[model samples]
Target: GPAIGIDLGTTYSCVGVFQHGKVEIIANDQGNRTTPSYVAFTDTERLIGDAAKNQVAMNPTNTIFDAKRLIGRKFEDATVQSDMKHWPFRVVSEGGKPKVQVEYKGETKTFFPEEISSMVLTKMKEIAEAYLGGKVHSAVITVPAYFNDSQRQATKDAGTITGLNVLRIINEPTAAAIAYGLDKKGCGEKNVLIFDLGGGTFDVSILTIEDGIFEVKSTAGDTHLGGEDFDNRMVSHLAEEFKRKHKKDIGPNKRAVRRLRTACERAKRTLSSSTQASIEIDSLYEGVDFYTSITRARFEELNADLFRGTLEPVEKALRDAKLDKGQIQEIVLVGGSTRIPKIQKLLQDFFNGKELNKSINPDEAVAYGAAVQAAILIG
Candidate 1:
């Protein structure tokens, strides 16, 4: 029997296996270690990961992305309701819980968030089995540290549906700590901070590490905050500009919004390393060309509040840990959103000019840690 580790992320997912006392990431059929957490349905079959994300522009309504945001949430949840307004796909309530509705094969179909997540997990399992040349029976999956009981249960259910035994559900920040601790073996009695800002969630965790034990001191986060929210801000700005110039509300059109989203994401990534980025979309709305240039300063201005929002959780975590920012010995950055320049700058300033230790690859650290845990459990 083989066991694997899974990082069930909001925007991307990864799987790793412990082999010969080292954690090796298992790449998907497409030869990528990380897969986009997306699903798309056609008249005949369903697509997951890269294949699904590619069809998003053409089949926006049938493609489901960010289902993690709705998982284990009720239809009456204020955050869920607010997010629904920005999503192109339809979300409906069933038995007081949120479910995604789509049309496939000329028939209406609905799916629970767990079911959608299971599809992703299933894909990871298949990839792992292929890479290992054996059946994988158990896995330790990572989740956000701030996930409620229901959310954690939902993730476990997703694993069960994927034919995994659901060995354990670990907190993402704790998993990162495990990886960091293993990297710096024998470092004793240190106060550490883990700052995670992923595609759809933000978490700040403080921990005490000594004698190979990683104890979480405190954790705080905003589940609704992440990279997607930054994209949404850009989308809203572009939508307003489009409406002002064309006298048409293109926001209601799923395809147009998808195009804009693609452009905005690219521009956002570009701005990470450049001072200015340009967004140009053809046939954006009514044969109108959409072109705009955004400077890094403007982007920081637009998302200043969002960057600030992350700090409140940082403060709360510190308060709960009974420590001040100056007392922290080290800071570890995790998650894809931490690459954003403004986010990095804000965190640096708050920590009194301490350089962040990004010794691990932010995108893969959680999965790596999960793999180590699985090995420990199997042994």
Candidate 2:
């Protein structure tokens, strides 16, 4: 019987199964290692994922992504509104509770963030059952280190809604550190920092290892920050370009803005290592064509403030840990945004000449680490 590992990320989800004395990813219907965390419900109540991602260009309002940010939040949470503003789905005050409503084919449907996320989790559970040939009863789930009690509880609820017995809720940075630490033999006894910048959150954690005991000294982060912020910057710039070209503004239209938000995220991923990328809007300003070229330097310029924003938390973590730059043994980088060359360079400079460690895959390491935790729990 294979144990289950769930990396319930803000933007995506990855599941792994323990088998034959090793752990491996459960492939989705697309034959890929990860399943898009987005869920869509049509007017007829038909659900979709990869298919919905494809339909986002035409039916952006129906597709719901990044529901994790809304998990465990209240409609009165002014702070959360800052992050929710960028999402395509309409987040409204419904009976004094935060709710997302989607309009599809003239029908309006309401969905709670937890319920939307549960749909994705249920899908993953089905995949696990199909691949393992047995029911997945227990799972080790990962969450952002900065997630508060309410947020953590919401994640646990998502697991429960899908009929999964969540064995533990591990922090994403801690999972990455576990994988990175296990792989390096020379990690000896030392204090290390884990910089976790994921698709929807950024966390800086300091951990101390001695006598086989790994303890998290301190953790600090901004739940409302991550690769998505970079995407928004790119999207805003692209919209300006569109305005310049057509003398029309699409930013104010809810439907068009929704489509552009998704396009912006895709463009950010493409521009990470590309000199230029083209963005196509099928229904914006009667259809629009925009080409945004972002050089590595340009990306740095666009995200400089975000890069600087991370420093405050890093400093807070170091202070909380009671350690200085020289006292740190190593700096481990984790998360998708860490793949940016500009971020890599900035990290090196901040760490006082210490090269950021990349011994683990930015994308898969958290799930791998959660798998290790699952193995520990099963024993």
Candidate 3:
């Protein structure tokens, strides 16, 4: 028998299966640990993810990510609308909910965030079923700890749509703690902090583990902030640079901005290992050539403010936990944003010479942890 766990993320999703005292990430049909979490409807009414994400540069109106931001939000929710502005997909009000509108073969169709997430969830379930050689009836899905009742319910609904019985909804940080705790075999007790910054959300949590019991002492974060925000900053700066080079205001241009936004994300990733990287966007501003090279130093400078924004919450988490920097036994870094050099250094410095732990792979830790929890629930 085997149990499964899923990390139902905003930008990407992964599922893990537990067997023989070990957890393994179940790769989708594409042989990838993570799914794009985006869905596109073609003229033939087929849904796609990997290929659709690749085509997002050309069809920004259909591909959707950050659906987590609108999971349970109403159209009147200012927070939802404010975030939607930066998204490349077309967002329209449908039945009082913020729905993504896409056109397939001249037919306009609307999709709720739950339906989009359900698609990703169904894919994960299929993989798990295939890997286990049987139907997987239940799973423990992880979500942000701060997710409200509505958001939590919507997550469960997504699971239902995928035909899986959601045994529980666990917190993202706590799930990470569970995986870490289990790997250590529940030895000596320790107090730890988890810094989770994903594509569209940020979460900081402090937990105490004693005798295999993991307890979250405190948690804080902003669901509206993460890698996307950093990319937006870079995009804004690059837009200004394009205007200076071409003598045109690219600020008012949404399509060009979308291309730059995607390029900025790619460049950000490239800068992690290289000093300089440039983004090339064709058919922009009437097929004019536009390129921006971002240096490591320049990337750091642009994101300095964004990095600063996280410190306050880190401090607040410490304060809430009623522990000093020295009291934290280990500082665990999770989520993709923690991959940034500056963020790693910032966390290291804050811990008073204690280097942040990176034992868990940021991209798959959440899903792996959820798999461990699924085993526990099935027991």
lDDT string for model 3 (143-209, tens) is 8877889999988998898888898998888788777764365477688889998887789998887
Descending-lDDT candidate ranking: 1, 3, 2
> What TM-score does candidate 1 reach?
0.83
Better of 2 and 3 by TM-score: 3
How would you order the candidates by TM-score, starting with the best?
Answer: 3, 1, 2
lDDT of 2: 0.77
The alpha-carbon lDDT assigned to residue 377 of candidate 3 equals 83
For each candidate, what is the lDDT?
A: 0.86, 0.77, 0.82
Name the weakest run of 10 consecutive residues (lDDT summed) in model 1: 179-188
lDDT of 1 by residue, 225-314 (tens): 888888888888878888987898987898899889889888888988899999988889889888888788877777888987898989
Per residue, candidate 2 scores C-alpha lDDT tens digits across 1-379 of 3577888777778888766666687787887677778887666654645666666666667788888878888888876678677776788877766778887556887887788888888877887888878687888888877679988898899889888888899887677766665434464577878888887778888887776466788999887788978888877776787888789898778777767778877767776678666676665766555544555566568778997778788889999988887888868787788887777777788888887778566777778778777887887
Q: By the lDDT metric, which is better: model 2 or model 3?
A: 3
